[PDB]
């Protein structure tokens, strides 16, 4: 009884032992190992320390302007603030957008737009998931829907051309007078190419439907200006705030505001169907402690020194892209234009699916990728290969070189095993295959250590040693 | 380059002042004020340092043993061991019951389990909001679907005997029979007395629907054995892990698995496929960690009494205010809540809720059974669990209650002033402009804002 | 070719001697037997003389002055006949009524209403099934949804009080306030009373839904002013134009027009793209002939006296019925039909539609508002619209009514045989097998077809 | 109160003078006039009789096996048989095919199915409208749902080619895999070639969707052999009863019964869904005297002299192509393998729209419809011709070139009228000035006259001058 008061203070490293050594564990892992994961990062210290503070008590239901509950002061002075920097942050006029920075993550932003603007079982297109697309743009086959979208919803993908890898438009044009979309996705998990805005904006228009832009994956090239920017084009554009952004997992939905057409003009209705429909519609109190954290990020995400730490992510892109092609890898549409790189990995005799698994073993992370072509979604043919987290180490073209090698020298032990299985065998035999025999196993133990060393050399984001 | 290292390295205090400045005027905030808002408590550091962790850059979609990336050798330790202690903590049973513990909030986890028993359209029920219902149980006009439930699903609320303020369950078991409901929520947001859960089983399974139970409001209650367990009865619970589980912003979903009745539980893969792939995306593994800690603390025999403490203010607070003349809703209550119909005192909670704000005292309206107008709520809502956590007892407590209701009497004062009639806004103006109020205001703020200093305030040392 | 013609110009007696057969021998089942069954009638010559015009042949998809193809000049002048003897029967101001009369039956009016002004998914109440009311107006159980209104749209039913066999008005107007119907249906299928149309109006008018009424059962019965209008409080009326209109099988949805409250009815179109191009392709121009005629028929003093007969058959049926000591639900009758609770003879519908049937006094069984078991329904419903359009008046259902309960007594005997317990099919059995039974059967059929032979058959001269 | 009773008996033509004048002003209508909407046809006496019979009385909810009321002994009888020769007019086995008579009409018989087999929001597929399909196979805008299909189901049309006017199958087939369909429809209310089934077979079970055939429009063909029966590779086969099958209006479902797929088999289940949906799921009582003289129908449909009826329906409309590509007309798909044929009027500079009121004027009945090309719906290109209903009067070859020519005279006439216009005229307009213009309005009575004189030369099926 006496103690409980004594138990709100013990810190964490004394109040729990147990989470404390995984936590620590961890921090060493992600030291010791290359992470090539398109989707990670690291997020600096500073937005570390806001999700920590007293922010987390507070409930806030509603927004600054009308809140269910008082004492908001302060909550409204950091919404508030959150979306000053968010607009800014992309150079948008007050005018023209508006943004909410409540959604709890990348997921709940897109549904939260869907809900708003779509409504039950109204239509949604988007790019097909083995051509690079993400589930919540719709993902069910011809006898289950399996993402909330799809259930929902009504949803039907577009793909792309498997001879050039990039999306194709014209077919894209042509069932959209069929399908009727209320809403078209801009947005991608896994392409090295940017998205013609343009074309799509076009698209939309003429079906009379919604243009999504979902950038969780550049929306930090975005803002430095590397990548073209989606919201040229775009009604609305949804976002995770990790990623190449930088920040703690969040996400916001960035609207439009004013004219939308002419004659004799007609409004933009957006701002308010999206809000209602984060709340009261699908989430309750927000995160404030992430909305903070938020906040750090876009501050530091207008810095010329996250500006320069975008360039570089690119330049190392394109530097292991180059490394490769040398190395006689096929690169799906042959480059990339951004932080990322499906290597197809037929053109060495094996598929992403064993390749994963072996690299991770070597403590080179990544994860396989179906490529345009592919038969089979049993048996993925591509890496995919990102550079943001690397490059917040400090990782330059020289050592992203390196990196290839590292890689490299992965497949050929992929290879190496999978010629030691047989034509048809199983992931579950070839990955057993590589757990009870000494003779690869040894061959991993070499490459897990030359691959941890290098990572030494480059330092770790985040607090000291957390 | 030269400077972008330090920069990721660099403390918040130095690298952004204006969010740290906010971050500092709130905890002062919280400090000098007195929280009686039923949802609201304070973490402890313990669970506030593990969100900062670096278990934020790790993305881990899937499930331990089936996650879509590797290198979660960590990740699944944790996930895990937090799921150990999930059933641990509630007593539960590994082999009767499952536990998910990815959702990102209380609302996330309802629908998620919304989301894999019922389906687009399928029918539910839960407690009418004006009688303490939650939104995410259903809220509709008879023109508009407002709330996610209620616009992807097809919601009826029960409501509760107006003169008992009780739920009316003979009436819920009535309608049932026409409704069909396919899932029946045992859930509040504002009700102080335990569920018949037993009786709602027996409706559930009369009509083959699901019984759900969201313990959002009483989960550190229930685990500390203070208030009926739900499950005892219920096949699915989910809960928010913050509230009165004083842990971080985060939700879970407990589901049984074993024979039903031969005929067995399918409910462990339908909730774990709708939460992922189906709503969410990589999990939030720092508020994992969070929620770990909290319930590593929650199993201890301080946060035990913390809870028996918890409960007994609340009736001393009650107590105190029947003493003072105020009307309670039912009568009194059996957990950390009270409703206080100020009917029967000539105001309503909407003005109240507000000066009494003014004074520092935080808390807010809700309609009592009776009201005919949801555009003025007899009642206001008061909760213990936070004013708990910083040490009040008893004593404390009933001076809190003279608190309240010295204010009560300055918003009744601003009522008078301004007439029998008038417009919410007519009366915010006078309780601002006139000598006499603000002036009040400010006496009973000070009052306040002393009393509260006497107490700690949970959390990271000082911000 | 040389015989291609003869064949297209050829009778049916010659060209198809089978169906012929058929036609006959059913001509002659219907005239030698007593219709009872509360949804037959007899269609006049004239009705029938229209079904065969070659109104059949032409396409006429659309409406007078909006049709899809051409020379639709006189289809035109039908259809637009037809809605004027339809306003024109029912005393509407063609200024805030209007009516499409392209429906193909009964069921599809009320789906083309529901598609129109429901939607997918949207809500309808309507009489439960078991109380007297149709399929149409909803019908699914806590497993699966049946009736087509039941799966495009949710329906929840209303009951009748189980001790006065009375629509609970009350309790209707209660839910509806949790339910939030878009439509209310003013129906039965088997009621005996007249509906309280103006109580339905509150109510509708309360949750700002629409109120539309089924009178397929007593269209005819309004027409001659015998029972009250649906038309004074409705904002729709859909009904079949067979039953107690006499016509042949179609439908009519009949729509307000002008003020509703300014603010005006916008039914007229939306019922209208509903019916087509919304459910429907080429419109039966023949059926609506047929309608048609019936209208002219049923403004008729001959129609009008038909009715009052109707009715007064039905009352003196009734009382003679209660005089044998039969219960009759809601004690008595204000229409065309009445529900027979066999309980107080010992015995069931069920069985009871059975033995009758094979004394050729054709009837059906209907479960009574106590009813426990609804695969044992307590109920017969008896009507006289047939009957009585063969000249039946009331010493002649009191003949009858002796007939039926003849035959009571012997579907009672085949139960002593068999047990106070057994089965359905235990029970036939023995209504088959036994010298004294089947004897006891044709004893009855005997004189139930003789006493029927007494009465004319209308229709086409002879068949 | 005595006159009633002589009410019911009084023949029509004295109980109601009224509607019997109709009548028989609509009798001589179609008399003079000449019949060219596909669609249309004339009943023979023997089922317009079957119509007028007792079988109106009769309530029978349910089917043979089980009925919700008794004495239903020949209603049975009607029923059996009535499917015992549906099942025999085309040569199906009753143990691989079921069939339900019930149906109100043909677009009720293929929402039965809707119902039974892909449920609220189910994907469905079909021919694209202006391209030639069917409203009930689907029908909406990019905002808003018109047709019962589109409203309570998810409806997707493919095309055809616009350079061969044929169905675009490679199309379907790719598109199929990003719609998934639960069920294609196979059927076209203007389209002159024969489907394949075959092809639309594989797409199916591909998508392990179901096929469902629409032969509304030459059901009539199918009995006689005339064009390929869509039972061969078919899960369903829905159609309409009258049109050029000849019986009264009314529908029927035909569906599989028995295994399905190997592997170990697995069964149809086609039969209850199909039979439950229709009642006690759409429909009441069935009407029976529509039953009636649909089994008088079918018994007519199965003599040779119907099988000759039909090669002749062929083999007219081909003499009519001929006449109409001689006199410089341009047939899409250049030609028909049935019934009907669609005439691109550009070919002549002009639209059907104008061109089917004039002609209309001349006592020449057809309709519009947009050509595979045309740009605009309100303007479509094409005429639809059929020759069914004519052919059931005795036209023979050459008979029908006479026909054609006078459906060019009016063609010219109808271009005579548009140059007097305008290039921005309306259809409001342009019909106003064929009828206040004495000019025209004369040369339409001189056809008109020369139209009605002809088909006076032909004689009237139906009953004696009813
Ligand atoms: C918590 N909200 C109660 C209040 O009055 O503020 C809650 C929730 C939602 O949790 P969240 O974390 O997303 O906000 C869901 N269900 C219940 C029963 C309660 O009490
Ligand atoms: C007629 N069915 C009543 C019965 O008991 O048989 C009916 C209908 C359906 O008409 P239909 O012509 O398609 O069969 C619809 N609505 C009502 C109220 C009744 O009474
Ligand atoms: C990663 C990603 C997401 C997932 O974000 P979460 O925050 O993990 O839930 C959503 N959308 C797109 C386009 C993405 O790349
Ligand atoms: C004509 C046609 C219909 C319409 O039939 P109705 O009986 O008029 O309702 C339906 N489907 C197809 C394919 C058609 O050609």
Same mark, same amino acid.
């Given at each position: 009884?006496?103690?409980?008061?004594?138990?709100?203070?013990?810190?964490?490293?004394?109040?729990?032992?147990?989470?404390?050594?995984?936590?620590?564990?961890?921090?060493?892992?992600?030291?010791?190992?290359?992470?090539?994961?398109?989707?990670?990062?690291?997020?600096?210290?500073?937005?570390?320390?806001?999700?920590?503070?007293?922010?987390?008590?507070?409930?806030?239901?509603?927004?600054?302007?009308?809140?269910?509950?008082?004492?908001?002061?302060?909550?409204?002075?950091?919404?508030?603030?959150?979306?000053?920097? =968010?607009?800014?942050?992309?150079?948008?006029?007050?005018?023209?957008?508006?943004?909410?920075?409540?959604?709890?993550?990348?997921?709940? +932003?897109?549904?939260?737009?869907?809900?708003?603007?779509?409504?039950?079982?109204?239509?949604?297109?988007?790019?097909?998931?083995?051509?690079?697309?993400?589930?919540?743009?719709?993902?069910?086959?011809?006898?289950?829907?399996?993402? +909330?979208?799809?259930?929902? /919803?009504?949803?039907?993908?577009?793909?792309?051309?498997?001879?050039?890898?990039?999306?194709?438009?014209?077919?894209? @044009?042509?069932?959209?007078?069929?399908?009727?979309?209320?809403?078209?996705?801009?947005?991608?998990?896994?392409?090295?190419?940017?998205?013609?805005?343009?074309?799509?904006?076009?698209?939309?228009?003429?079906?009379?439907?919604?243009?999504?832009?979902?950038?969780?994956?550049?929306?930090?090239?975005?803002?430095?200006?590397?990548?073209?920017?989606? !919201? @040229?084009?775009?009604?609305?554009?949804?976002?995770?705030?990790?990623?190449?952004?930088?920040?703690?997992? &969040?996400?916001?939905?960035?609207?439009?505001?004013?004219?939308?057409?002419?004659?004799?003009?007609?409004?933009?209705?957006?701002?308010?169907?999206?809000?209602? =429909?984060?709340?009261?519609?699908?989430?309750?109190?927000?995160?404030?402690?992430?909305?903070?954290?938020? &906040?750090?990020?876009?501050?530091?995400?207008?810095?010329?020194?996250?500006?320069?730490?975008?360039?570089?992510?690119?330049?190392?892109?394109?530097?292991?892209?180059?490394?490769?092609?040398?190395?006689?890898?096929?690169?799906?549409?042959?480059?990339?234009?951004?932080?990322?790189?499906?290597?197809?990995?037929?053109?060495?005799?094996?598929?992403?699916?064993?390749?994963?698994?072996?690299? @991770? &073993?070597?403590?080179?992370?990544?994860?396989?990728?179906?490529?345009?072509?592919?038969?089979? =979604?049993?048996?993925?043919?591509?890496?995919?290969?990102?550079?943001?987290?690397?490059?917040?180490?400090?990782?330059?073209?020289?050592? /992203?070189?390196?990196? +290839?090698?590292?890689?490299?020298?992965?497949?050929?032990?992929?290879?190496?095993?999978?010629?030691?299985?047989?034509?048809?065998?199983?992931?579950?035999?070839?990955?057993?295959?590589?757990?009870?025999?000494?003779?690869?196993?040894? +061959?991993?133990?070499?490459?897990?250590?030359?691959?941890?060393? /290098?990572?030494?050399? /480059?330092?770790?984001?985040?607090?000291?040693? !957390?």
């Amino acid at each position: 009884w006496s103690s409980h008061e004594q138990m709100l203070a013990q810190p964490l490293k004394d109040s729990d032992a147990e989470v404390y050594d995984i936590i620590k564990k961890e921090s060493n892992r992600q030291r010791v190992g290359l992470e090539l994961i398109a989707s990670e990062n690291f997020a600096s210290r500073a937005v570390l320390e806001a999700l920590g503070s007293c922010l987390n008590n507070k409930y806030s239901q509603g927004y600054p302007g009308q809140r269910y509950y008082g004492g908001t002061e302060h909550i409204d002075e950091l919404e508030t603030l959150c979306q000053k920097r =968010a607009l800014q942050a992309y150079g948008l006029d007050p005018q023209c957008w508006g943004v909410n920075v409540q959604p709890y993550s990348g997921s709940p +932003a897109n549904f939260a737009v869907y809900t708003a603007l779509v409504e039950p079982h109204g239509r949604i297109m988007g790019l097909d998931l083995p051509d690079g697309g993400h589930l919540t743009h719709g993902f069910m086959t011809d006898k289950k829907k399996i993402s +909330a979208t799809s259930i929902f /919803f009504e949803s039907m993908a577009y793909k792309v051309n498997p001879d050039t890898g990039y999306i194709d438009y014209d077919r894209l @044009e042509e069932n959209a007078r069929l399908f009727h979309p209320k809403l078209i996705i801009a947005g991608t998990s896994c392409y090295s190419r940017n998205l013609d805005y343009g074309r799509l904006r076009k698209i939309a228009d003429e079906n009379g439907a919604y243009l999504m832009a979902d950038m969780a994956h550049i929306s930090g090239l975005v803002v430095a200006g590397v990548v073209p920017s989606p !919201f @040229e084009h775009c009604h609305v554009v949804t976002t995770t705030t990790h990623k190449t952004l930088r920040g703690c997992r &969040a996400g916001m939905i960035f609207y439009r505001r004013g004219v939308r057409s002419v004659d004799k003009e007609i409004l933009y209705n957006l701002e308010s169907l999206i809000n209602s =429909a984060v709340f009261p519609g699908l989430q309750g109190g927000p995160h404030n402690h992430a909305i903070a954290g938020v &906040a750090v990020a876009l501050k530091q995400a207008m810095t010329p020194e996250f500006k320069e730490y975008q360039r570089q992510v690119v330049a190392n892109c394109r530097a292991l892209s180059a490394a490769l092609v040398e190395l006689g890898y096929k690169i799906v549409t042959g480059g990339s234009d951004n932080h990322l790189i499906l290597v197809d990995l037929r053109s060495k005799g094996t598929d992403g699916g064993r390749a994963e698994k072996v690299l @991770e &073993a070597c403590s080179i992370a990544c994860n396989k990728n179906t490529c345009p072509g592919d038969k089979s =979604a049993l048996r993925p043919s591509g890496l995919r290969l990102g550079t943001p987290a690397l490059t917040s180490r400090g990782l330059l073209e020289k050592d /992203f070189q390196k990196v +290839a090698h590292f890689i490299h020298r992965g497949i050929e032990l992929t290879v190496q095993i999978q010629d030691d299985t047989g034509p048809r065998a199983t992931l579950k035999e070839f990955k057993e295959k590589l757990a009870g025999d000494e003779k690869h196993q040894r +061959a991993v133990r070499a490459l897990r250590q030359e691959v941890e060393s /290098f990572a030494a050399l /480059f330092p770790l984001p985040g607090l000291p040693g !957390f």
